Amino acid sequence: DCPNSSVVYEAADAILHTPGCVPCVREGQASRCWVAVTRRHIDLLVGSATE
Amino acid sequence: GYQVRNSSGLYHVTNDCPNSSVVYEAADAILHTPGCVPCVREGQASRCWVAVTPLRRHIDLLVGS
Ligand SMILES: *[C@@H]1O[C@H](CO)[C@@H](O)[C@H](O)[C@H]1NC(C)=O
Ligand SMILES: *[C@@H]1O[C@H](CO)[C@@H](O)[C@H](O)[C@H]1NC(C)=O
């Protein structure tokens, strides 16, 4: 449905299907997280930005 | 934490994941994005731009294996 941006959609889906808490550690503005996929896991760095 | 005074009473709320809030925010924003989130391979990861629901702010993220 949305194939070239899939990797994100997979991650986003894993965050929602995480019943617990996604473990994150803040790196200034951005926070580094480890999302487990239902072994393997997704590494993600998320941050906010303003123009 | 912090308190809330809504229509159903007086409450006290504590975020069980204070550092994980942007992740949940982004995950929601990706699903509410009607188009497709613009990604680019940036190394061994994927650099994406997520527009947040409304000085215009967005969410930058990198996903990897
Ligand atoms: C939140 O981030 C800070 C700074 O990276 C870290 O010291 C702390 O342990 C983190 N807290 C949680 C609940 O993950
Ligand atoms: C009451 O405030 C609390 C905390 O935000 C929430 O659990 C509850 O659903 C709110 N109720 C309404 C009607 O806003």
Numbering used by the authors:
A (entry chain C): 15 to 52, 68 to 80
B (entry chain A): 0 to 53, 67 to 77
Manuscript excerpt for this entry:
Here, the data collection and structure solution of the N-terminal domain of the ectodomain of HCV E1 from crystals that diffracted very weakly is reported. HCV nE1 is composed of 79 residues and contains no methionines, which makes this construct unsuitable for SeMet phasing. Heavy-atom soaking experiments were attempted but failed to show any useful anomalous signal for substructure determination; therefore, efforts were focused on S-SAD methods. By combining the data from 32 crystals, it was possible to solve the sulfur substructure and calculate initial maps at 7 Å resolution, and after density modication and phase extension using a higher resolution native data set to 3.5 Å resolution model building was achievable. The work reported here shows that useful phasing can be obtained without the need for high-resolution diffraction, or indeed strongly diffracting crystals, if careful data collection is carried out in order to obtain a highly redundant data set from mutiple crystals; indeed, the useful anomalous signal of HCV nE1 crystals did not extend to better than 6.5 Å resolution. The nature of the crystals is also very important; in our case we benefitted from isomorphous crystals, facilitating the scaling and merging of the data, whilst a high solvent content and NCS improved the quality of the early maps.
S-SAD phasing was applied to determine the structure of the N-terminal domain of the ectodomain of Hepatitis C virus envelope glycoprotein E1 (HCV nE1). The HCV envelope glycoproteins E1 and E2 are located on the surface of the virions and are responsible for binding of the virus to the host cells and membrane fusion. Although HCV is a major global health problem, its mechanism of fusion is still not known owing to the lack of structural knowledge of these two glycoproteins.
